[PDB]
Amino acid sequence: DKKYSIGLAIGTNSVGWAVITDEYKVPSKKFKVLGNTDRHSIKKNLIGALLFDSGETAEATRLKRTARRRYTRRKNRICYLQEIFSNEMAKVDDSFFHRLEESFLVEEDKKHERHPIFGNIVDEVAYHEKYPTIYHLRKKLVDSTDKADLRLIYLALAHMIKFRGHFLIEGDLNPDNSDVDKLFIQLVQTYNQLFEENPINASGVDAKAILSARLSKSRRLENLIAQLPGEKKNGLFGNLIALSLGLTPNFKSNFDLAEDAKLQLSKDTYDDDLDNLLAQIGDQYADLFLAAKNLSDAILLSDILRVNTEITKAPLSASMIKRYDEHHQDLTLLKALVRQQLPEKYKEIFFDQSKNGYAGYIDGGASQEEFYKFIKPILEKMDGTEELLVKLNREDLLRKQRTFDNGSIPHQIHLGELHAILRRQEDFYPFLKDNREKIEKILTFRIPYYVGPLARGNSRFAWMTRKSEETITPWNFEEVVDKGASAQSFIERMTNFDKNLPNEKVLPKHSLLYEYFTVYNELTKVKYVTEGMRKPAFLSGEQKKAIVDLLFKTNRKVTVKQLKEDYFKKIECFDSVEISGVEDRFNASLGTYHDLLKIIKDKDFLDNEENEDILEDIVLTLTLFEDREMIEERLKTYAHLFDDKVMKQLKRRRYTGWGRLSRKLINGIRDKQSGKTILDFLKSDGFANRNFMQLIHDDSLTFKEDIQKAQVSGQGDSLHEHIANLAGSPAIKKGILQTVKVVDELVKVMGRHKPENIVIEMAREKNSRERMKRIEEGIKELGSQILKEHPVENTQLQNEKLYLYYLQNGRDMYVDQELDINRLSDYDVDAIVPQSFLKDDSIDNKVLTRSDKNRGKSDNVPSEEVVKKMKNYWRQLLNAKLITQRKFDNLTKAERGGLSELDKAGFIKRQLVETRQITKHVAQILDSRMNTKYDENDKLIREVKVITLKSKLVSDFRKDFQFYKVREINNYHHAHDAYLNAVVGTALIKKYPKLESEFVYGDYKVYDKATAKYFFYSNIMNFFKTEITIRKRPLIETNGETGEIVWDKGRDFATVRKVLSMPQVNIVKKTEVQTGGFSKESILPKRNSDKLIARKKDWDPKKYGGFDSPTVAYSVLVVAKVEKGKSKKLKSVKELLGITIMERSSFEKNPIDFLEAKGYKEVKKDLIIKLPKYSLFELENGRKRMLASAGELQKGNELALPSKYVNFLYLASHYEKLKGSPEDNEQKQLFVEQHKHYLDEIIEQISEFSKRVILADANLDKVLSAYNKHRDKPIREQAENIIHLFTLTNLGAPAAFKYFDTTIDRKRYTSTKEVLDATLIHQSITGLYETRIDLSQL
RNA sequence: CGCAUAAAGAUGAGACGCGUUUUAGAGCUAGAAAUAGCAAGUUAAAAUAAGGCUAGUCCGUUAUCAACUUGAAAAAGUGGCACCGAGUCGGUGCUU
DNA sequence: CGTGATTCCAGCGTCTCATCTTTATGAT
DNA sequence: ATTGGAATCACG
Ligand SMILES: [K+]
Ligand SMILES: [K+]
DSSP: OOOOEEEEEEOSSEEEEEEEOTTSOOOEEEEEEESSSSOOEEEEESEEEEEOOOOOOSHHHHHHHHHHHHHHHHHHHHHHHHHHHHHHHHHHOTTHHHHHHTTTSOTTTOSSOSOTTTSSHHHHHHHHHHOSSHHHHHHHHHHOOSOOOHHHHHHHHHHHHHSOOBOOSOSOOOTTOOOHHHHHHHHHHHHHHHOOSSOOOOTTOOHHHHHTOSSOHHHHHHHHHHHSTTOOTTSHHHHHHHHHHTOOOOOHHHHTOSSOOOOOSSSTTHHHHHHHHHHHSOSTHHHHHHHHHHHHHHHHHHHHOOSOSSSOSOHHHHHHHHHHHHHHHHHHHHHHHHHHHOGGGHHHHHTOSSSSSHHHHHTSSOOHHHHHHHHHHHHHTSSSOHHHHHHHHTTOSSOOSSOGGGGGOBHHHHHHHHHHHHHHHTTTOHHHHHTHHHHHHHHHOOOOTTTOOOOSSOOSSOOOOBSSSSOOOTTSHHHHBOHHHHHHHHHHHHSOBOSSOTTSBEEETTOHHHHHHHHHHHHHTOEEEETTOSSOOOOOHHHHHHHIIIIITTOSSOBHHHIIIIIIITTSOOSOEEEESSOSBOSOOOHHHHHHHHHHOOSHHHHOSTTHHHHHHHHHHHHHOOSHHHHHHHHGGGTTTSOHHHHHHHHHOOOOOEEEEEHIIIIIOBOTTTOOBHHHHHHOOOSSOOOHHHHTTOSSSHHHHHHHHHTTTTTOOOHHHHHHTSOSOHHHHHHHHHHHHHHHHHHHHTTSOOOSEEEEEEOOOOHHHHHHHHHHHHHHHHTOOHHHHSOOOTTGGGSHHHHHHHHTTTBOSSSSOBOOSSOTTSSEEEESSOTTTOOOOSGGGEEEESOGGGGOOTTSSOOHHHHHHHHHHHHHHHHTTSSOHHHHHHHTTTTTTOOOHHHHHHHHHTTTSOOOHHHHHHHHHHHHHHOOOEETTTEEOOSSEEEEEOHHHHHHHHHHTTOOOOTTTOSHHHHHHHHHHHHHHHHHHHHOGGGHHHHBSSOOOOOOOHHHHHHHHHTTTTTSSSEEOOEEOOSEEEOSSSOOEEEETTTHHHHHHHHHTOSOOEEEEOOBOOOSOSSOSOOBOOOSOTTOEESSSSOOHHHHOEEOOOOEEEEEEEEEEEEETTTTEEEEEEEEOOEEHHHHHHHHHOHHHHHHHHTOBSOOTTTOEEEOBTEEEEOSTTOEEEEEETTEEEEOOOOOOOHHHHHHHHHHHTTTSOOSOHHHHHHHHHHHHHTTTHHHHHHHHHHHHIIIIIOOHHHHHHHHHHHHHTTTSOHHHHHHHHHHHGGGTOSBSOOOEEETTEEEOOOOBOOOSGGGGSEEEEEOSSSSSEEEEEGGGO
8 A cells, every 4th residue: 555656758669657656766576477487476676668669640541542542543534435435446446445454464364466556566566656656646636637546546535534634723724825925025015005104114025034934933023023124023014924923913902992802823713703803993904814814824834835836736745746856866866976986885875774874764763863964974075965965954855755744734735635636536436526525524524622532431531422322423423422512521520529519510710609709708808997986897788789789890890999989988978988807909809790791781681680590601601612613502592682793792702710619509508597598698697797718617507517418428539539639649649548558557566556646758759852842942932043053962951050051042141141061060050049048959940150159149039230130131031931930030039029037937937847738638638547536526536646747857857966868778768767757746746836736737726026937947956956056955855834855865866876777677669560561562573583472363473573572460470280392291390470461361361271371281270379570589598589570580688787887978978068067077077087997898798798688799799899999099989989889789670880980780680480489478568467478388 | 818920740632743563666687506786765555552342433551459368349357565685686574 | 502691672752622739929 | 761571692
């Protein structure tokens, strides 16, 4: 019945747990051992850590599922096209589609001729010579008027449908207009035709180059405006240019229409809004817009076509043919020049696929960029390659037709080519004439994002509802699918239930009931004071209703002056009015009401009580649907109430956002006695004038009981389902779940006695490609040429100094100069907010400067002079997204207030008190699971106090009192951090009960200027220290009030050092059955290997290739009989099989038949043992091996290095220096100098451990030789290399490390034969309960 | 108190472009062959987790998972204490 | 001629839309 | 980046 406490450190890859007593001692208990081994009881300390792999997200799974859906839908598209052509093709070529379907098979497996298109070699060769590429055939079919073979027509249509281009552009793109300059001149002429007072003159400006430039859209607009004399970016011409290029312009200011009238041409609603804009100004202006529309295409098409469109109606096919012709010409010229200049390289360029030459560019794995990088030095070191070099710099040398950059092709181009082909060939083939709409729909059909998968209740990701129970095709999609209901469900399935009534859905944020609720909430909280009042009083119901009718329904916002004058002075005739409890401007307002009043021009319609649900439906319809058609079809049922103009005005209006309260709570539930709702009480509460919080905090009112009863099961979820509801990374959710499970197990271990306290801390927790994307966007938006100066690699940009240099355009960010790319390691990286105020080391709070002294004073924000100097550059960086809003706000804080003492004190406080929501959720879960007993008067009995700590407290405790931590030594540091968390939390809640509200989960009212808080929180951990800065403290600390020994410096520190020096710590790696992909996604070429996995049942890997490297879900220990020799005699073998992910379901269906098929016979089902990954085996001398897979092992022992060695390593390695004053820093340096021999000792330790467990003889000899080689190196470098050295003895998968210049590879244990005779250990989640099975006895 | 913005992240849906694999695009000449020289090279079909049944324009890489017993499953149950110590836990006394 | 040491290799870019939470800035 | 699969390679 001894009282104890639990300490926990939560991480994404570890959960450390510890049990402490009143003395802060870690108990040790004898735990029973199950199994067939002679061992029956083992002594174990109640401290350890659970290790597991990081919890993966579902992004990869979602992407692969979407890819599967896309592939299935593309195959169906092809099937639809074939079924359209089925009869006519069968009349023309019976087995053409069969040959297409079996084109993948080898000649042996084909049931028809090997030539798919024509079925004979002569016609196939003739076709391939006449049409070298599919685009030649497409252009021929588009342009030629002669009757063509149906097979070629189908091939062109299938090539268009299968690869149909993106749908990011809505509307119709006419390929006829391509010239940028011509359409720009047309737009200028139209503008001058309508505007004579200030005509636009753009003659002498290279429109093509500027408008089709490779810079950003914003920078293109800025360049054009700069080259336009007397024109503004926000002007009418500037807005037209922005619309044409793609940036959405606001057209209100240009015409003073008082309506935004935003027009984005890519958006489909543009036309409607365009018409709206016309109704505001006139009809002729659209002509200019019309020209602008054309200009838009003139940009986009010019990016992809770059070909004449007057000769042919298929500009894409013409562009691909031009690419093919240029490729042929350049290839011939390059071959001739190479033969005449550098013959010895010719093979390497044109025959060896291994290199990145033309042979590797066509036949090998080399890409266009790799081929260009390989061939540029050759072109430079040659004559007559000027045109080739020009094309290469333009990325237009030997280009393929199917390349990575074809993603910019809109679907309109392919649709136009398809329409042209169908028009050409409809006369000869009647079915093409009849089914032209069908093929166009097949090409153009796209499932709306709000419809989702077309399932029939067998999918967990589907929400669509079907009007009729019939199979869905692209031609009857609009008739079968209930688009409105599906669109509503798309929003409603992902939205939030209100926290009070989980069954009900929340109202839209712009719902009229929501706004009335907020306004009445604010009005009830109004404490008016005027002359003739003995006491301040709240407003009554009638007065509040009159104010709402007069003030809020006639004004968008209500201020105190309007309340005093228009209501108190006009009606109440009181000229003296002082308000209390509210600010000048009321937060709540009737915005939706005013918008509806403007739209419908009627007050009685809005104010009618009986029809307000119609308006609540209106706002819901406007919130739910984004496409205007859905809103139109939903509001067509309301056509009679409004007019056609009113409907057109309502259609454009769109609302966004959802509230936090449901309709049933606000106005559905009623008090039993009164018969009034929450809104009714808000309207007329009486003299009380209770607000919403007091409404849901009133015991007498039935609302509290109704709210409690609605969540009769609370969340109504299991532990796992409750944790899944938390917002955060999946890895941290996995850590939380493991934490809860280990807490339950620890409670079970201690005799079902709940701990007095549970202290918990939680940690704060490719990139290069993100950096490349960010720098590209920023430089393109800014318009700089810094990137072109030096091509920086993805790994090279990882340097923080270089990253800041590139993000700041190479300039010093505080002054007006430019830094040098080669003068690195000289500039300083300084934080905008001092590290004392805010410990942030991210890019958003770091700035590279030539000298930090230019920042001014380092005790505050950068000075006002720096802000005045570089505000323009900071804003320019912000507009380029090189710096974020937070960074810019921190930079310009000096002009807006700088940093006050209160803010600094708050920043100091918020580094000790945990204010993260995820930690609060963990504390709530633990408190709910550890406090199940209720006090009689509706109170929780807090038998277990849940305390939340921050890592800063434990880190300071470690640093100040020589309890140093090195993560490379072993995984004991997790358990040690958990124990230190427990000790610190228990001591803090012992000495300072008043801080429970800050630390213990729950709400407490015990609270007891800026400098007082600053030094109170700064010295909240100073009662552990013997001396302060030079005041001293007593050896034994006292609680105060009630006398308790919270800390004893003469005893407790020794106990802590003994605990941290304990060799036995329960380090358990969570065994997991591996799940994921079946094998590597890379399809391998055909080879005579048994390790290849067929991609289909009928595709033999020796003839078609396939995947390899399967992922083993779990191994299976099976003893059985195998056939040996020609006689196939039965030999007894006990072996691991390693059931893979692909074979897991087959094995679990029936293991006996699976093992019989694998080759093993007489398998024993009972003796079959399932071993997931990281299964623990003990062999001899304490050597432990974890089962990485069926044929690989991992190190499973830990090096219990003495605490003195860890402290010496931490002191000598200078972790961010020693972070101490010169006195103690010199003392620690002397400690290192006089304890230099510890290094040798540490090496000895490692060596002996390596000889006892690791058994890496070659690596151990190599590392010993390396250590002897660099014995004369400085102590700091030797200590750092020795810290790196511990990777050899680390627990887990072997990894390669580096000792100075020498590198040591990983010694992998690729044999699992030893563990077949070892002792398998099943460890519970804490490792205290173990089951040891001696496998040699099987 | 709330409100605005930004950033980050989670989840879900709809698309695009590649990549990879096999086949098709009779390679020619001198050769007995080994080969040597020369010619050509851009494209397409199919698959893109094996596959499953619920047969859908669906689902298949997330989360969960020591052992034993009771079980569709969710899950439920199973493991004395104190003291001395310490090379991954041992010893002693009490108890069962 | 098995067997330990050594080497190599691993699907990847883009866009549109919606909902949510959390952190960090401020206005008021 | 990582760590298991696969092939290659040196060799006693
Ligand atoms: K998993
Ligand atoms: K386990």
